[PDB]
């Protein structure tokens, strides 16, 4: 069980850790988050009380280093940093724990939600979507645009998701126009899975990361990517059976976790109705179709 200490909390902020959140008051004696489960990536995220503009946060994995948060009054945000002195870090955390100045990661024993949302998400793949190679952790915020968004403006601050475009020469082979457009199996299995992602685990990892950035930061390009990666599978007549079964589980837990009051902006009516009711895979997502119908029947 690892720890992310805070130097201090000088501005009033709502802090998120994975699917949990709590409020910290201005100059409240708060020194971080303890009992963080090892074995998963995590995200620690922030919404200032005075400017709800820009949710921002950091993806990290406690196995990769000792990380802490410190507010920067010049740039005006809580920054993640790596502490390279292991003994200094252990000593800081032990003092803050002794004084009970840390919130406990509040995981219920029965609860597999975070595992289920991050099953295929790996830090190494996050760091290739979010390029900042001098840090072991990755910053994301509400405003960051994707590489494909920039093709349609600072490249250093982009989300390098895999570009998917159904009306493109990568997605369509010469002479297979109608075939490849109406059945995207070629594009899914040969171009993306065999060629780009190498396996379905990496594809699912990017799909899950895109969803989580959409949900936690309201990142619009991430929402676009999530829906495109779903539509590409649903629009393929030929999909490995294990992929369909796993997709149904992935989406079930994403829909379960989505805040009810964000469904209007985070769910694309066209994609979901097409996937659940018109697509090749309309009969292959039983768990997802049942939670969607019981939770968001209005969308459909």
């Amino acid at each position: 069980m690892n720890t992310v200490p805070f130097t201090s909390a000088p501005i009033e902020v709502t802090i998120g850790i994975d699917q949990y959140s709590f409020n910290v008051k201005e100059n409240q004696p708060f020194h971080g988050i303890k009992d963080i489960p090892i074995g998963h990536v995590h995200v620690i995220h922030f919404q200032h009380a005075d400017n709800s503009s820009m949710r921002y946060g950091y993806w990290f994995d406690c196995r990769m280093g000792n990380f802490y948060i410190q507010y920067d009054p010049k740039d005006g945000l809580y920054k993640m940093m790596e502490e390279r002195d292991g003994a200094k870090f252990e000593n800081i955390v032990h003092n803050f724990k002794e004084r009970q100045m840390m919130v406990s990661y509040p995981k219920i024993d029965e609860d597999d939600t975070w595992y289920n949302l991050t099953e295929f998400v790996q830090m190494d793949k996050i760091r290739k979507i979010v390029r900042k190679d001098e840090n072991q952790f990755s910053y994301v915020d509400s405003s960051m645009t994707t590489v494909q968004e920039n093709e349609l403006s600072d490249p250093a601050h982009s989300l390098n998701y895999t570009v998917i475009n159904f009306k493109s020469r990568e997605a369509i082979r010469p002479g297979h126009e109608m075939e490849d457009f109406l059945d995207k199996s070629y594009y899914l299995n040969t171009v993306m899975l065999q060629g780009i992602f190498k396996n379905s685990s990496n594809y699912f990892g990017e799909l899950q990361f895109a969803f989580l950035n959409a949900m936690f930061f309201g990142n619009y390009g991430s929402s676009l990517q999530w829906h495109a990666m779903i539509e590409l599978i649903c629009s393929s007549a030929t999909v490995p059976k294990h992929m369909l079964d796993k997709l149904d589980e992935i989406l079930y837990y994403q829909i379960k976790t989505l805040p009810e009051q964000y469904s209007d902006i985070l769910l694309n009516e066209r994609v979901w109705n097409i996937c659940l009711y018109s697509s090749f895979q309309k009969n292959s997502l039983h768990n997802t179709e049942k939670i969607m119908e019981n939770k968001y029947p209005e969308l459909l």
Binding site: K167, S168, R169, I172, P174, E177, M178, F181
Partner: protein, 237 residues
């Protein structure tokens, strides 16, 4: 973007453009079977691909053999159309290729755009105009070459005959769309109007009769009357 009344003179500028109409590609007769069920029998069709500035019509005849053994023919017809427009553009010299293709039905957008992804500088556009190009098969010589075809064939026509020697392409297109709207609203009457007078003939190398300028004004007036009427007889007005 979409083509409508606000940008109608764009059709007659010097940027090469083609209209594509697919309404006569997949044509059927519906009939009863011996067991009392219903079946379709396909008949020859055509793609209507027209340069509105020059009058050049690229009429690709769609022979019924292209449907043999195929499923979902109404959907295939749009993709077949797109693939036929795609070969036509590819055969044209670069300086003759269009800068825009305007489809008369929005369901042709995605098939044509997927077929021309390797031609990114050609704009594929819908239109809000209700153009009467379906009535092309009411032009006797066009219908004749389609129905006689025994194999796929491209036939080239100028749908304006020699009119551009005396009128502008705006006026020629307006005349064409009036003639076709008439033929579409009441084919018998429209055809009576066009041939009532035996002294006016259709040249062997033309589609329409050899009217003088004054006779065209008469004819055009008669077609307007036909259309306004039928619209009465239709709506009781």
């Amino acid at each position: 973007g979409a083509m409508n009344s606000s940008n109608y003179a764009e059709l007659f500028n010097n940027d090469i453009k083609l209209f594509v109409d697919d309404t006569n590609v997949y044509r059927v007769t519906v009939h009863k079977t011996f067991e009392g069920n219903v079946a379709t029998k396909a008949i020859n069709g055509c793609i209507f691909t027209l340069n509105p500035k020059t009058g050049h019509l690229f009429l690709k005849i769609i022979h019924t053999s292209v449907w043999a053994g195929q499923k979902r023919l109404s959907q295939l017809a749009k993709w077949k159309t797109a693939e036929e427009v795609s070969a036509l553009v590819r055969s044209l010299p670069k300086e003759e290729q269009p800068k825009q293709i305007i489809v008369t039905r929005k369901a042709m957008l995605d098939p044509l755009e997927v077929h021309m992804l390797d031609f990114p500088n050609i704009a594929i556009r819908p239109t809000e105009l209700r153009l009467p190009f379906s009535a092309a098969m009411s032009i006797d010589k066009l219908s004749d070459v389609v129905m006689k075809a025994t194999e796929p064939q491209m036939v080239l026509f100028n749908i304006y005959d020699d009119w551009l020697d005396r009128i502008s392409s705006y006026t020629a297109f307006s005349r064409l769309t009036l003639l076709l709207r008439a033929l579409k609203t009441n084919e018998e009457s429209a055809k009576m109007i066009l041939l009532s007078d035996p002294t006016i003939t259709i040249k062997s190398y033309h589609l329409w009769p050899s009217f003088t300028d004054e006779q065209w004004i008469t004819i055009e007036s008669q077609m307007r009357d036909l259309i306004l009427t039928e619209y009465g007889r239709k709506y009781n007005v």
